[PDB]
Amino acid sequence: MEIKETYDFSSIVDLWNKNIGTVYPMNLELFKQNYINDRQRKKIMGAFNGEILIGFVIYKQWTYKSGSLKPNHKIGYINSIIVDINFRHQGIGTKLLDAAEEELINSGVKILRCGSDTYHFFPGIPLECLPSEEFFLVRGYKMQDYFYDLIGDVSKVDFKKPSIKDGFKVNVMKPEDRKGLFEFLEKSFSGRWLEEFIEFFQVGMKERDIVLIKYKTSVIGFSHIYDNKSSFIGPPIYWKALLGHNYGGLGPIGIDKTYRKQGLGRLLLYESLQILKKREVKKMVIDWTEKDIINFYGRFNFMPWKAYRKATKEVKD
Amino acid sequence: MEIKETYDFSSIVDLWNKNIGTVYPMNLELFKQNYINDRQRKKIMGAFNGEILIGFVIYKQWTYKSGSLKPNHKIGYINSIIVDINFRHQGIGTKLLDAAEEELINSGVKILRCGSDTYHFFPGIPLECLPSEEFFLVRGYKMQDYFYDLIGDVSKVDFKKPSIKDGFKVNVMKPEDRKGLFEFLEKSFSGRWLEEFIEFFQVGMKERDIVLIKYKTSVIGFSHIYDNKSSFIGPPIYWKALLGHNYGGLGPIGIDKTYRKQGLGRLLLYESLQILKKREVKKMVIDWTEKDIINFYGRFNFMPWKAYRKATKEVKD
Numbered sequence: 001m002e003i004k005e006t007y008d009f010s011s012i013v014d015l016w017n018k019n020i021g022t023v024y025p026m027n028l029e030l031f032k033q034n035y036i037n038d039r040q041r042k043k044i045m046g047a048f049n050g051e052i053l054i055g056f057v058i059y060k061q062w063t064y065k066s067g068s069l070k071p072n073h074k075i076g077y078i079n080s081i082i083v084d085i086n087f088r089h090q091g092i093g094t095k096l097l098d099a100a101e102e103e104l105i106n107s108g109v110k111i112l113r114c115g116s117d118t119y120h121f122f123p124g125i126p127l128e129c130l131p132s133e134e135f136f137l138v139r140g141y142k143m144q145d146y147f148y149d150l151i152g153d154v155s156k157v158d159f160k161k162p163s164i165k166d167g168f169k170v171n172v173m174k175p176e177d178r179k180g181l182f183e184f185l186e187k188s189f190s191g192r193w194l195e196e197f198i199e200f201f202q203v204g205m206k207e208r209d210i211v212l213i214k215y216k217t218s219v220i221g222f223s224h225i226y227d228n229k230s231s232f233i234g235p236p237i238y239w240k241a242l243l244g245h246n247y248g249g250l251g252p253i254g255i256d257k258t259y260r261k262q263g264l265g266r267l268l269l270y271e272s273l274q275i276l277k278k279r280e281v282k283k284m285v286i287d288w289t290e291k292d293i294i295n296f297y298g299r300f301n302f303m304p305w306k307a308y309r310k311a312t313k314e315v316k317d
Numbered sequence: 318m319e320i321k322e323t324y325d326f327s328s329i330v331d332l333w334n335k336n337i338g339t340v341y342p343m344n345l346e347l348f349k350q351n352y353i354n355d356r357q358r359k360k361i362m363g364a365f366n367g368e369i370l371i372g373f374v375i376y377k378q379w380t381y382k383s384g385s386l387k388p389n390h391k392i393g394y395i396n397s398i399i400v401d402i403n404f405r406h407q408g409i410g411t412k413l414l415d416a417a418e419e420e421l422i423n424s425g426v427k428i429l430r431c432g433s434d435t436y437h438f439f440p441g442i443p444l445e446c447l448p449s450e451e452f453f454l455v456r457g458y459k460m461q462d463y464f465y466d467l468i469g470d471v472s473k474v475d476f477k478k479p480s481i482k483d484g485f486k487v488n489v490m491k492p493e494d495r496k497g498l499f500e501f502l503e504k505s506f507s508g509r510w511l512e513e514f515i516e517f518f519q520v521g522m523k524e525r526d527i528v529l530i531k532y533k534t535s536v537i538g539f540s541h542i543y544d545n546k547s548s549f550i551g552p553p554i555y556w557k558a559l560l561g562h563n564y565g566g567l568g569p570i571g572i573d574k575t576y577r578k579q580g581l582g583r584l585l586l587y588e589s590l591q592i593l594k595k596r597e598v599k600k601m602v603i604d605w606t607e608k609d610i611i612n613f614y615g616r617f618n619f620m621p622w623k624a625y626r627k628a629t630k631e632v633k634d
């Protein structure tokens with residue numbers, strides 16, 4: 001067996017699907033979108049039996065800015081790691097992760113995270129991969145708390161509009177709104193979300209995927225919505241092969257801090273979901289939510305669907 | 318609004334699906350099988366707005382034997398409870414559960430369990446219903462640990478046979494094996510599992526759904542397997558609408574204690590899964606597993622799919 005770099009995406013995707021595809025179905029379109037577009041220092045290492053790929057690890061160092069956030073070179077990520085099911089418990093996963101970690105560490109990394117990277121596949125260790133928690137624990141990762149993707153079928157329920165105090169307008173974005181959107185982001189959400197807006201417009205997000213809320217003419221919040229015509233495969237629709245025909249998604253969503261807890265986020269979510277409903281969306285997902293926010297969406301009949309554990313390894317000096 | 322008994326199964330099923338059907342799709346066949354066949358003292362109470370059902374609770378007292386286990390009348394169950402999404406946070410769930418609990422309590426109940434009943438729909442509070450944990454906590458239920466349904470696609474992987482020491486034979490059950498199976502159950506698994514064997518043969522399980530392992534002629538273990546020709550809808554195939562065409566399932570599985578940790582359970586599981594594979598099964602589920610046993614199945618490419626929390630309320634004297 002040899003560990004060496006591989007950019008054979010079909011082989012990686014095939015191995016991904018054979019092992020975990022029941023619950024994380026992968027397609028080449030998504031895999032290449034996410035791997036190729038990522039701007040961090042990144043590598044894929046494979047484990048090989050002759051010509052046969054039997055496992056891989058994908059890993060990154062935070063070397064490229066996030067909005068107004070400087071990159072912190074102290075931080076590295078394990079985007080994913082899979083050993084083929086016919087080759088488990090032979091030390092291959094260990095050797096893969098030792099190779100990744102040793103490189104990151106030589107390049108200045110002191111904090112290693114499971115998923116949560118830019119262009120992630122996972123917010124954390126998936127619940128369907130719960131046995132791997134013990135793998136990471138054995139290597140010095142600490143387990144933390146959970147994030148959730150939520151699922152709902154927007155065609156099955158009707159809701160009544162939160163009562164609209166006047167002045168607040170909710171509408172799909174137009175091109176001329178881009179400046180006002182960016183200025184609102186630098187103000188309120190100027191890290192990863194700002195960066196995602198910049199990058200996602202570069203990889204095929206269109207104005208029709210964005211809903212804006214304004215008080216008068218000031219942009220005071222936004223959501224991003226997905227359906228089967230979106231060009232960019234964003235996190236809400238990663239696992240679209242599980243979601244049937246007329247799938248969709250939503251996230252992120254945000255409201256200017258000085259406008260919070262007045263019912264406006266609820267109005268924004270209400271209007272976003274009506275748009276999707278009118279687009280004939282059925283099953284849809286809200287990705288990467290915290291526990292304490294579930295009920296916000298749960299009022300609209302969303303339920304936790306997938307769970308992920310944050311996990312972090314602090315490198316010893 | 319009125320609370321009163323209802324046996325309008327279509328209405329109950331329709332409400333079930335509108336609210337939670339994305340993740341627990343229900344059909345009338347399953348709902349009636351499970352409700353009607355249950356032998357415990359049982360009731361369904363509904364919450365009504367005039368003629369419209371807006372919520373229900375299904376509850377049971379343990380009044381009928383389980384194998385060699387006497388029924389313990391101290392124990393009651395909440396099989397399920399759903400308030401319609403348009404009527405939440407109005408106290409309806411509270412009134413439903415107060416009605417159920419007050420009855421059980423008058424009839425001698427001192428321990429109340431969330432799911433886990435005979436003919437259950439849930440081993441515990443589903444993860445997709447995680448927000449309800451707070452509902453139960455507010456009412457005095459304590460949250461305990463988790464059980465898991467596992468999912469795997471048996472058509473995607475090949476495995477090699479655990480090395481067979483001679484004497485041990487693994488085969489589908491025949492009619493003449495029923496005595497030896499029962500005698501082995503009274504010995505090794507004489508509670509709920511014995512009872513399930515008795516009852517499940519009464520509701521359409523056939524010899525083809527049972528795999529036996531024998532040393533010589535003594536039955537030393539069994540599994541129960543499911544495919545799309547099974548007559549009985551058992552727990553592994555409850556949520557078959559999520560599992561596609563050629564769905565299947567497995568569970569329970571057991572080996573005589575004096576034969577454990579010798580590789581025989583693995584052989585039994587191996588052979589059971591080959592049978593399913595040859596039956597052309599694809600996606601299949603192993604229901605209601607504990608954490609510490611996941612890796613047993615995980616060797617065969619099964620992954621946690623759904624999670625449920627045990628929860629129990631001790632009634633105050």
Ligand SMILES: CC(=O)SCCNC(=O)CCNC(=O)[C@H](O)C(C)(C)COP(=O)(O)OP(=O)(O)OC[C@H]1O[C@@H](n2cnc3c(N)ncnc32)[C@H](O)[C@@H]1OP(=O)(O)O
Nearest residue numbers: 080081082083088089090091092093094115129131132134
């Ligand atoms: C950020 C993310 O990518 S999260 C997703 C993680 N990936 C997955 O869950 C995909 C499916 N699982 C896998 O691909 C593999 O099981 C891996 C990658 C987790 C581990 O690969 P392997 O080649 O089996 O691991 P390796 O043989 O190096 O195991 C090292 C030790 O880790 C621990 N370990 C590994 N797997 C397990 C397990 N399933 N349960 C408990 N402990 C485990 C053990 O101590 C093991 O030593 P042992 O074999 O002496 O018991």
Ligand SMILES: CC(=O)SCCNC(=O)CCNC(=O)[C@H](O)C(C)(C)COP(=O)(O)OP(=O)(O)OC[C@H]1O[C@@H](n2cnc3c(N)ncnc32)[C@H](O)[C@@H]1OP(=O)(O)O
Nearest residue numbers: 397398399400405406407408409410411432446448449451
């Ligand atoms: C064994 C099983 O059946 S497990 C599955 C449980 N069922 C479900 O999860 C199905 C979907 N959910 C529901 O049907 C409902 O949300 C129910 C049945 C859990 C609760 O019904 P309701 O009619 O909303 O509950 P009710 O209004 O009586 O709530 C009482 C209190 O419980 C607590 N509670 C209820 N729902 C929630 C929630 N989603 N998050 C936090 N606390 C809650 C609150 O303290 C609430 O008081 P408040 O309204 O003053 O905050």
